RNA sequence: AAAACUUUCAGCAACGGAUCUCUUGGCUCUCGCAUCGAUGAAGAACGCAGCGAAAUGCGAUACGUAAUGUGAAUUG
RNA sequence: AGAAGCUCAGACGAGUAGGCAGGCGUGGAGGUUUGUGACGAAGCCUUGGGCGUGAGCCUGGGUCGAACAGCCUCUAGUG
RNA sequence: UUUCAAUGGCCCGUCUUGAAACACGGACCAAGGAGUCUAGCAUCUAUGCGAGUGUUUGGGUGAAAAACCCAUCCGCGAAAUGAAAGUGAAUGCAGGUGGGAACGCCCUGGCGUGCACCAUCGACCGACCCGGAAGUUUGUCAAUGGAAGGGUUUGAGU
RNA sequence: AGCUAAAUAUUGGCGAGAGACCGAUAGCGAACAAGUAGAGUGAUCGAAAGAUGAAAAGAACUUUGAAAAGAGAGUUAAAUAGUACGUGAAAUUGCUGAAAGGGAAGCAUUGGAAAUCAGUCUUA
């Protein structure tokens, strides 16, 4: 026998989407070829993010794309923005700048606002033709840890995390262990 | 967008034609139809 | 017992509830019955408005 | 397909109705077609069978046999036809029952009630 | 829509020309050349393709186009051969030289075996 | 579906996934939340602090209807208007300023989170926070309090 | 057209309903891959089935 | 077995409309029809539109 | 160390009634309806057929009478 | 080149309680197969033959007498 | 397939530190026979929309318990915080620092740029501990009011 | 002090329609002569049990026996459907054939012996 620490250490990766979307399978086929046949580390990233699940691909918004593309020091203003995921709308921004965004999905409000403001909406396959190697592209992500679950993950003594309460209120987990007047505060 | 011919009672082609509706450009999703059909076909079951 | 993540359970199911369960399989049958009565009333009271 | 809500499409209920039908219903259940001559003469597609009718066997082992209806055995849904017998082992003769739909009527037993039946069912006598 | 999505929908799993077994599936497509389920060989899934079948001692060859794909009745064209097996092989690669040549070997095999089918029928 | 369940994969394994030593018994720990101060105290005081005891004063016949006061922020005030109104009034100097009645939109207070464009606008509202009204005033608008 | 609408205008018979938009614009990956844009930049085509 | 099992399952209306639109689009594609099983090898045109 | 006996296998015959197919039955849901009794109800007893013990029907007018409909049976 | 495919290379292989994955078999439902069948369906017996690591499947012979199955999916009183 | 020879091979299931056990259950065979359903909750996955979302309580419609369509509510989310009265989230490019995905540039590295994420320093909102400026009217001296500023404490916040 | 329809409920009764239900150890306890037969003083308890065939054509006749039956014959598409009736499994049993057996048997590996069988070739 052999003295081996760990046996058949499977990697924590996904080799294909769990989605059955035929169009997503087509995009996977195109970007699998692009990643395999080019040295574009961008294409490898897009292939990885196509495999990812919904919770690992959070939404991004028009305003957040505008904020990330209009920084002072950065000159990434005209570069095409790339999101592997949806691009939701932000109605809090009354005037939308001109943006060229390529993403899996656009909400109807976001797509209408972009095209009205003068920009353009692309799909991942269309960006595979404009910038096949991902040159002059700003690859961005949504705030993954903005889900409700991460309010609760890591709950414990003195962790300042949200509890699982059936009803937020005064008679609902506020007395013993939540204030120094009732025994102790945790 | 392309057009489609209208066929008479005898199967001949009429002069008039109709533009192809946009619904025939919509995405074709076998998985979505399967999941929706799976659910909808359950909506006429009788209890036992 | 209680050892899993999530809310503390609150299921008010300590009475004999299975005797008083109410199903809604007559929901379309009730809907059709109301319309026929509604159409009967409209035909009975015509020409004056139904409501 | 049926569209009436008062008619049963259940195989169970239809079979119970057929086999629990009283004598007055088995009278209409046991109907036989008319021959070409009677059909073109009376304008009637088919009529219920009756005793003393002159009919011809159409199907079965006794195909082509001729005889009068000696007795409509309603409770067993069988027609007993004269000269249509079978020889038992001991030599006795047992009449053989023939289904009503497997015969054809070639001469009716015209009564006034039968004449009224013919003229009522869109026919001519 | 497009040829790729057509294959993704049909082909792969469910088709009226699919015959699955233990772990292998046959393509009974009357337009397939090799009888294998593939993008290369399913004219339902892909654009213009060829195929051949037999009738009463002679053979006929099916062909396709692109612009007429919306007219099922006149989409597909038939050409008929009743002369010889060698001539039939000549006709096939002649009608595929100006065409994607990947199907010449598979087609000529189909012609030559169907002719052997005819000879064995006679014997 | 039962044909993709785990009871279909334990057919043949004796204990059915529950062990041979400890076994699957009815209620080895009690029924429900019973024991949260004696033997479930480790779970309760670690994952549900505050569960036991009283806090605060006790109110009889509480009705949420007279306490109904949903809130809106400043940056959502312009979104409360129709698009035609926005295109008519944003960025263009007009002698008449738009009226945004937040009560119709279903709010009982205007809060001060966010910024406003440089166009005067009338805000008709039941309540308003201190700096929300200050921002509106400095933006050229006014707050008219309704009943 | 009135029953289903288009992908940019409301269907008349389904209030506030727009036809769905696809996550891929061109669904013909073979021609998309074999187009000049992709084949003019991909590195040299490595060998197929390899000798042992 | 009890009658208060869940016999009917709820589906979002928008997803139902998505599935209707997909099913109508598929009906316009001749290749899917032949796969589905319909003998349309000599149908004059797909989609087949006939006079009023 | 032959037969018998014991065991295994096969054919055939038993014992037994599993399997398969069926189903005038049950179960469940839905729809429509409101109608017991001192003018003697529900239930019980005992009787009634050419040949009957049960089931079904009936009450000394007793497997029923009157009346209406159908139109030639019943049947061992 | 059923790209869910093909191809090259290296390392490794114990397992109770337990976990997970992919498959096998049973009853019913939608679709499908120009599907099987009184010229013998299903079931049953078999010192016959073949396939799979296995769950299991196929087939010859006999018996029998009216129905039954493959593939894609749905479901459960499923071993 | 049967049988012989040589070699090996204890009776399974079970609780148990340990069962071939002089521990339990089991004579045999056929059919039946044990993680189901529902109200919830939590992670993970898939789908549709997305600052929204949810047709199905009802209405319309359909000759038909299906499907299809629709009004006004409402549930959850878009704001927290306090026991409450109540107040209620931009000094800044919605902020600095470190690591960073992807891209650009330069001659393996270097420079610029920094998504997501965590370490971290500050700002804002509320509670708490101070602090009492306007204003309000009503007692002006007072009553009411609570801005500036101070904590480096607190929240399931921005 | 009092009356009052509709919208509401409906494991009973009466009458209809169905069903992703059960398919004779299942589904009601009861598919059948079932709340029956049977048990208990009583209150009560409570089964088992469906299928010849298209049609009884339910086996005339002869022969052996006291008889039940048997053997012939006859009926049938079929008695390998004869009422002890569709199909007719396993436990268990008798007969026949084959082989083994000195105080267990069964099992695994490897080959001999006997029995049995297919591929393969034959052709191109």
UniProtKB/Swiss-Prot annotation, chain D:
Keywords from UniProt, A to Z, are:
Cytoplasm, Nucleus, Ribonucleoprotein, Ribosomal protein
Database matches in PROSITE patterns: RIBOSOMAL_L24 (PS01108)
Provide the primary localization: cytoplasm
Q: Which Pfam families match?
A: KOW, Ribosomal_L26
Please cite one Gene Ontology biological process associated with this protein: cytoplasmic translation
Q: Name the domain of life this protein comes from.
A: Eukaryota
Q: GO molecular-function annotation terms? A: RNA binding; structural constituent of ribosome
Which GO cellular component term is one of those annotated?
Answer: preribosome
Write out the similarity annotation.
Belongs to the universal ribosomal protein uL24 family.
Q: What is the name listed in the Swiss-Prot or TrEMBL entry for this protein?
A: Large ribosomal subunit protein uL24
Curated annotation (Swiss-Prot), chain F:
Its main subcellular localisation, reduced to a broad class, is: cytoplasm
Task: Report the subcellular localization.
Answer: Cytoplasm
Q: Which InterPro entries match?
A: Ribosomal_uL15, Ribosomal_uL15/eL18, Ribosomal_uL15/eL18_sf, Ribosomal_uL15_CS
Superkingdom, natural source: Eukaryota
- Write out the GO cellular component annotations: cytosolic large ribosomal subunit; preribosome
What GO MF annotations does this protein's record show? structural constituent of ribosome
Q: Which residue intervals make up region (Disordered)?
A: 1-35
Tell me, how does this one assemble?
Answer: Component of the large ribosomal subunit (LSU). Mature yeast ribosomes consist of a small (40S) and a large (60S) subunit. The 40S small subunit contains 1 molecule of ribosomal RNA (18S rRNA) and at least 33 different proteins. The large 60S subunit contains 3 rRNA molecules (25S, 5.8S and 5S rRNA) and at least 46 different proteins.
Membership in a protein family: Belongs to the universal ribosomal protein uL15 family.
List the protein's name. Large ribosomal subunit protein uL15A
Record organism: Schizosaccharomyces pombe (strain 972 / ATCC 24843)
Provide the gene name from the record.
rpl2802
Swiss-Prot record, chain G:
Localization recorded for this chain is: Cytoplasm
What binding partners and quaternary form does the record give?
Component of the large ribosomal subunit (LSU). Mature yeast ribosomes consist of a small (40S) and a large (60S) subunit. The 40S small subunit contains 1 molecule of ribosomal RNA (18S rRNA) and at least 33 different proteins. The large 60S subunit contains 3 rRNA molecules (25S, 5.8S and 5S rRNA) and at least 46 different proteins. uL4 is associated with the polypeptide exit tunnel. uL4 interacts with its chaperone ACL4 and the nuclear import receptor KAP104.
Miscellaneous field: There are 2 genes for uL4 in S.pombe.
Family per similarity comment: Belongs to the universal ribosomal protein uL4 family.
Q: What's the domain remark here?
A: The eukaryote-specific C-terminal extension harbors a nuclear import signal and delivers the ACL4-uL4/RPL4 complex to the pre-ribosome, triggering uL4 release from ACL4 and incorporation into the 60S ribosomal subunit.
Annotated protein name in UniProt: Large ribosomal subunit protein uL4B
Organism encoding this protein: Schizosaccharomyces pombe (strain 972 / ATCC 24843) (Fission yeast)
Curated annotation (Swiss-Prot), chain H:
**Cellular localisation:** Cytoplasm
Of which family is this protein a member?
Answer: Belongs to the universal ribosomal protein uL4 family.
Subunit info here reads: Component of the large ribosomal subunit (LSU). Mature yeast ribosomes consist of a small (40S) and a large (60S) subunit. The 40S small subunit contains 1 molecule of ribosomal RNA (18S rRNA) and at least 33 different proteins. The large 60S subunit contains 3 rRNA molecules (25S, 5.8S and 5S rRNA) and at least 46 different proteins. uL4 is associated with the polypeptide exit tunnel. uL4 interacts with its chaperone ACL4 and the nuclear import receptor KAP104.
- Chain's role: Component of the ribosome, a large ribonucleoprotein complex responsible for the synthesis of proteins in the cell. The small ribosomal subunit (SSU) binds messenger RNAs (mRNAs) and translates the encoded message by selecting cognate aminoacyl-transfer RNA (tRNA) molecules. The large subunit (LSU) contains the ribosomal catalytic site termed the peptidyl transferase center (PTC), which catalyzes the formation of peptide bonds, thereby polymerizing the amino acids delivered by tRNAs into a polypeptide chain.
Reproduce the miscellaneous comment text.
There are 2 genes for uL4 in S.pombe.
Tell me what this protein is called: Large ribosomal subunit protein uL4B
Q: Origin organism of this chain?
A: Schizosaccharomyces pombe (strain 972 / ATCC 24843)
Q: Which gene encodes it?
A: rpl401
């Amino acid at each position: 026998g052999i003295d081996i620490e760990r046996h058949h250490v499977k990697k924590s990766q996904r080799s294909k989407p769990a989605s059955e979307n035929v169009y997503l399978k087509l995009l996977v086929k195109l970007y699998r070829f692009l990643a395999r046949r080019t040295d574009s580390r961008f294409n490898k990233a897009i292939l990885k993010r196509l495999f990812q699940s919904k919770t690992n691909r959070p939404p991004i918004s028009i305003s957040k794309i505008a904020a990330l593309t209009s920084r002072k020091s950065a000159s990434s203003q005209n570069k095409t923005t790339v999101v592997v995921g949806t691009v939701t709308d932000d109605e809090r921004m009354l005037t939308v700048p001109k943006l060229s965004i390529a993403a899996l999905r656009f909400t109807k409000s976001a797509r209408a606002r972009i095209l009205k403001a003068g920009g353009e909406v692309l799909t991942l396959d269309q960006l595979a033709l404009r910038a096949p190697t991902g040159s002059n592209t700003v690859l961005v992500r949504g705030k993954k840890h903005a889900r409700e679950a991460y309010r609760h993950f890591g709950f414990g003594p003195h962790k300042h995390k949200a509890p699982y309460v059936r009803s937020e209120g005064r008679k609902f987990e506020r007395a013993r262990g939540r204030r120094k007047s009732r025994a102790f505060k945790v | 967008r392309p057009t489609v011919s209208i066929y008479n009672k005898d199967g001949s082609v009429s002069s008039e034609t109709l533009a192809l509706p946009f619904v025939f450009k919509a995405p074709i999703r076998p998985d979505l139809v399967r999941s929706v059909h799976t659910a909808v076909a359950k909506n006429k079951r009788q209890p036992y | 017992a209680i050892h899993v993540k999530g809310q503390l359970p609150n299921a008010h199911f300590h009475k004999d509830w299975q005797r008083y369960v109410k199903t809604w399989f007559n929901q379309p049958g009730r809907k059709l019955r109301r319309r026929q009565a509604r159409q009967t009333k409209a035909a009975k009271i015509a020409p004056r408005p139904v409501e | 397909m049926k569209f009436s809500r008062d008619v049963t499409s259940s195989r169970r209920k239809q079979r119970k109705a057929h086999f629990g039908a009283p004598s007055s219903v088995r009278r209409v259940l046991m109907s036989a077609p008319l021959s070409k001559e009677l059909r073109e003469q009376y304008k009637i597609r088919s009529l219920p069978v009756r005793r003393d009718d002159q009919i011809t066997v159409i199907r079965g082992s006794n195909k082509g046999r001729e005889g009068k209806i000696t007795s409509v055995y309603r409770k067993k849904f069988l027609l007993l036809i004269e000269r249509v017998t079978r020889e038992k082992a001991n030599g006795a003769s047992a009449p053989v029952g023939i289904d009503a739909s497997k015969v054809v009527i070639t001469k009716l037993h015209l009564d006034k009630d039968r004449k009224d039946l013919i003229v009522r069912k869109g026919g001519k006598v | 829509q497009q040829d790729e999505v057509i294959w993704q929908v049909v082909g792969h799993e469910f088709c009226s020309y699919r015959i699955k077994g233990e772990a292998q599936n046959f393509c009974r497509n009357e337009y397939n050349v090799t009888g294998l389920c593939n993008r290369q060989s399913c004219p339902l899934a892909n654009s213009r393709y060829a195929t051949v079948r037999e009738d009463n001692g002679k053979l006929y060859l099916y062909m396709k186009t692109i612009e007429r794909a919306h007219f099922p009745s006149k989409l597909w064209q038939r050409i008929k051969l009743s002369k010889n097996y060698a001539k039939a092989l000549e006709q096939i690669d002649q009608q595929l030289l100006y065409w994607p040549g990947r199907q010449i070997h598979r087609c000529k095999q189909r012609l030559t075996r169907l002719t052997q089918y005819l000879l064995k029928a006679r014997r | 579906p039962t044909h993709v369940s785990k009871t279909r994969k334990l057919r043949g394994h004796v204990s059915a996934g529950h062990g041979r030593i400890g076994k699957h018994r009815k209620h080895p720990g009690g029924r429900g939340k019973a024991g949260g101060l004696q033997h479930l105290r480790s779970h309760f005081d670690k994952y549900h602090p505050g569960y036991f005891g009283k806090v605060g004063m006790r109110r009889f016949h509480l009705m949420k209807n007279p306490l109904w006061r949903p809130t809106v922020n400043l940056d959502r005030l312009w979104t409360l208007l129709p698009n035609e109104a926005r295109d008519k009034y944003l960025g263009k100097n007009t002698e008449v300023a738009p009226v945004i009645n937040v009560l119709q939109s279903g709010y009982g207070k205007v809060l001060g989170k966010g910024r406003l464009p440089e166009t005067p606008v009338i805000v008709q509202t039941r309540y308003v926070s201190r700096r929300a009204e200050e921002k509106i005033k400095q933006a050229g608008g006014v707050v008219e309090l309704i009943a | 057209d009135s029953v289903f609408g288009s992908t940019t205008e409301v269907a008349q018979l389904k209030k506030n309903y727009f036809l769905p938009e696809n996550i891929i614009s061109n669904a013909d990956v073979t021609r998309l891959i074999n187009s000049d844009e992709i084949q003019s930049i991909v590195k040299a085509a490595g060998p197929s089935r390899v000798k042992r | 077995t009890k009658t208060w099992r869940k016999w009917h399952v709820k589906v979002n209306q928008n997803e139902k409309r998505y599935a209707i639109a997909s099913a109508v689009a598929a009906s316009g594609v001749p290749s899917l029809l032949l796969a589905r099983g319909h003998r349309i090898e000599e149908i004059p045109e797909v989609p087949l539109v006939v006079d009023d």
